[PDB]
Subunit: 369 residues, 4 copies
């Protein structure tokens, strides 16, 4: 039996572990943290990620208790500038914990061996993974799914450009308060942009009938807008229609102003080691596809390992096949972020939706625009 050692229990690592286990690999997954958890409050998935979930046998648990808004709406200075439904392209909003739980439960159901407090500190291309405990594990495949600060990557040495932004946002889950919001379209995604009187934006993202995912975005140089716990007054001033939800947001002492971070590498493979997710390709969140691409790439890795080739050759074939979708999406999302393109509305163009349109199960693009 082929053995895989996966470093990291995020969406990339769990996807890799499930996909490999379904194909008969002996899979062990190692999470550095003391518990299995997902940070970031909420998350969007699209057709591509939902198809991965179908491929993993985890779609049912995800769709139950998650939300597809009637439309993706954009506001500029409180004026609705677009409503987009992507010509039926499937999409979904959920809490991070909801997605995480579904993947963990599926991995456990399949008998994936999951270890917590288990940090990969070094990886060897010949197929050896060293944990912080000093345990050296031999494997036929090593998956570096260990995030932007991947030690699987950096122990080997990959030529790279990394960037941590000065700016960021505050992501929270609060109650919907739907009745208290009164008249409106409060099941929508609403991306609420402003440049005047200050640069403040809220991405309003319903997760289900109970939970609302809010992203509060202000520059780091704004001492009030970037404050945690949230400066209620400055958010209510520019988003008064969300006051009921913002009052609940202001109670959260766990709120963090998290910075954006990107990674791009010359390659994603070395011998029997494959880098997946933020370890390889962390990107700007404009197109809401960092985890989508991570999951597609992890699932696609399992596919290329079923061709009867050596692991080394399968990994090379995998990157060649799948990386361009991620490269283009990363580049375009970065362009969108820098140009504030989403502020215009109607920017989920055919090109913007390329990654979302990809079906990893059939390996074709679907849901034409």
């Amino acid at each position: 039996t082929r053995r895989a050692e996966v470093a990291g229990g995020g969406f990339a690592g769990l996807t890799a572990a499930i996909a490999l286990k379904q194909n008969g690999w002996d899979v062990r997954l190692h999470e550095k943290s003391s518990e299995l958890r997902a940070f970031g409050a909420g998350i969007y998935l699209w057709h591509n990620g939902l198809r991965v979930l179908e491929g993993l046998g985890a779609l049912d648990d995800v769709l139950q208790g998650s939300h597809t808004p009637p439309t993706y709406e954009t506001w500029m200075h409180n004026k609705s500038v677009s409503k987009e439904t992507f010509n039926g392209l499937p999409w979904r909003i959920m809490t991070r914990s909801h997605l995480h739980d579904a993947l963990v439960n599926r991995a456990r159901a399949l008998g994936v061996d999951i270890s917590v407090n288990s940090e990969a500190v070094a990886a060897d291309p010949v197929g050896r993974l060293t944990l912080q405990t000093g345990e050296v594990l031999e494997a036929d495949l090593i998956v570096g799914a260990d995030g932007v600060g991947s030690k699987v990557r950096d122990s080997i040495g990959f030529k790279q450009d990394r960037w941590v932004s000065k700016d960021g946002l505050i992501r929270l889950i609060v109650p919907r308060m739907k009745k208290e919001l009164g008249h409106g379209e409060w099941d929508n995604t609403i991306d609420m942009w402003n440049f005047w009187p200050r640069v403040q934006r809220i991405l309003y993202s319903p997760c289900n009938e109970n939970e609302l995912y809010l992203g509060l975005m202000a520059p780091a140089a704004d001492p009030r807008g970037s404050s945690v716990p949230i400066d209620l007054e400055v958010w209510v001033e520019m988003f008064p229609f969300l006051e009921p939800c913002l009052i609940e947001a202001a109670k959260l002492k766990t709120a963090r102003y998290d910075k954006y971070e990107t990674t791009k590498l010359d390659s994603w493979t070395r011998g029997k080691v494959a880098l997946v997710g933020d370890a390889a390709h962390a990107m700007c969140p404009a197109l809401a596809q960092g985890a989508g691409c991570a999951m597609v790439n992890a699932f696609s890795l399992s596919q290329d390992l079923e061709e009867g080739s050596s692991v080394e050759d399968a990994l090379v074939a995998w990157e060649t096949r799948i990386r361009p979708i991620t490269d283009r999406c990363q580049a375009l999302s970065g362009d969108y972020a820098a140009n504030r393109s989403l502020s215009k509305g109607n920017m989920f163009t055919p090109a913007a939706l390329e990654a979302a349109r990809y079906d990893p199960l059939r390996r074709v693009y679907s849901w034409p625009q």
Copy 2:
């Protein structure tokens, strides 16, 4: 090699033929008409039917050149009473020819032997199909996909209740005239109900950027509203906002006032003969699921024939497994039609969407409400 003879080249027969051919059956399909064509102007499919298309390898050709509205909207007396998006449940509108062409092209690509001017006039449960030419074909499976007036069914004799309504509607494809319609949400499905000043209704159904599917519904006792070609004045009077499209509709000399028709049988099988689609279960169109159920049932038949059982036993197992979804949907659609339930809006309830939610590929219900 197992041989199947399929009577009828509608959506049920083509689905059966493709699904069987994909599983290695030697399939021949017989269409009574001189050409392969689909009547009825336009058609809605939902998740269940779209999943059948995925199973048939015909989804790509269908999604290209078809439309998912941003919302399914209902009007009563020109007042919007509901907007429904079904919590992300996939759905699609297309011309009948668009769906038909996709299925025919797929059947031809797989090497299904299609005959036109080939009418099944008698079927024997032992596996003999007699054509109007006098040709007697022996087969391991006979599929009666030959519509509400099925001769495969009636030559054998199935206890049945059939009903042809006095009332009906006029279904047409016209240009979108989107610019000429001016301000509005003209990519929506809009079910435009009226009881005052007369009983007149238009189901407004965009198929793509070029083609609009209209259903003009008035009682048979209304000599103007039921007239073909359409009485332009009486339609413009109550739907003045559609005048540009109605002017184009009035040019169509091919317009027909078609009656609603239902069939229900005590059983769908006899020996090696299976009845699929309108031959077995024609229903009211309120839930837009007659072809959806027909396609699910045809696809499901192919599945039950892969269990290693006798054809006779597989057919019995098939009906037992799949019929209840169709029975409930038929009953509920008839209830909706009789009570004019759709006129209230917000009537695509979890129960109404049961058939749509069924995934025939995984044999589970998806897209929870």
Copy 3:
């Protein structure tokens, strides 16, 4: 000093009494009822009536505590069909008591001698008024302002057509409940028409920040819709958006289903007797001008009595000058009522607004359309 005896303490009689007293007449007014009061809940005035109030020195007290809606809106089956603002033509809504009080207070301020429990039972063209007490009062002018059942008129004998309708309405004052009505344009006049599922209409008429005037109109043959106190269920069913106000309306045990009533006479004068208001020209309320015309005619009477002619000649001149405006408005309002013309919206045409446009102070038409 010239002496006038006025029969009736309604809007016509009070207007006549004030206007005459301002011109130096010794005026006595006789009200049959035990108290000075105005029935009918609320009332609309337009430019013509507001100009009379200006002429009477009673405009200030009327405008304080009354309401001009931002627009006059019409709904058919809950769909807004028109919004009308009459090109700036002044108009106003108020409670009947508000208008009544303003006129009574002005009459008292001028020293008009007002008697209650004082019914005119006979009038003589030579200038004698007999009260129910048997008191015979001699005067230079007798004003029959004693309503649709005028005894001043009928004691003399005027050729006439009177009509009392079988149908009618329930008029009430309730609290605004503005906050409880939620999203909307609840300061508007909204004429809420329906023919389906039943013939039920509400004229929604805000009087000020505290008081709402509702007219609930259903046919007499409808036992539920015409019931008093109101059948809450049947009104909430068709006007659910007014439920907070309708709950308050249902508490009113004083509610009446009052019938429409009209009067038309061959003449309005006989010797020293002049008939004013409903005594002469009761009309359908479609154009909201019965009191408007009554007040214009009463004020105009005082004007014609300042020409230095005999009272008999002044009265003849008065009717000749002013009656055609009332005749046309009565006729058009009756046409509108019979044809349900207001149900279409946009029916306050230049012709419909003729009476409203008349300025009695300058004797010209203003506020062109």
Copy 4:
């Protein structure tokens, strides 16, 4: 017969001349310009100014061919922030020429002696007016209605503060293009504010079915926004919904970027000389009351001259009676302009509307808020 000499043929001078002529004064009016004309494209009047017009016998000609919008609407960054109708307070929009013509025609009808190319260069408090021709005219009253640069004022010497702003606006009349504007509320006043992406504002003011009054406001430091003829691109960019009207505006080679200008004086009188209008009290246009106050003050002057006092005493009484309304309105309009208060919407408060609410005919405040 009392003789009045009026310097200036603007709204103040024409009002003074008509009002005095109606009271039996021998009135001569002197306009410096070669023709009688009014600059500034369009103008708003309110109840106070409309009542002056009624007092002048010029209301009929003004209301015919002018417009009361259904509402006064305010936008910030294309989002509607308020709709105001002032609780029925009368108001009106018209072209400057429309108002001017009505006043000139009334003055001519009354036999006011109007001279063009007749400039007042000096005034003496004893009642002598010297024209640029050298003609010295003796009079019982001299009216300085000669604008912000009044030579009647400055020849005498009045302690004053004058201010000419660096900023200004471009005022134009263009066709309505109502059909070309498509869906909207295009009969409204719409004050269209923006601070982002640049400081640009359009006051949209329909005058009648044919003519639209536009005020295009940008800072003088903006070389494109302040350009004449208008820089079409920069106006269409921020007001694309007005493109049809802006294309017509760009054709006007007569367009001017006119600066705001204010005047405030310690007194308005000296002996037999009275200063009226912009000569005395030019103000910021935020409350749209510069001409309103000018007309009220000119009309009020005629009233105080009917008390049987000396002209000198009547003038002192006039200023004491009427100036505080103008002082408060000037101050508040300046505050509004400086604070950009109108950008918030809902700022026509009872205090803001004080001047508008004043009725000069009855000398009371009407139309309570």
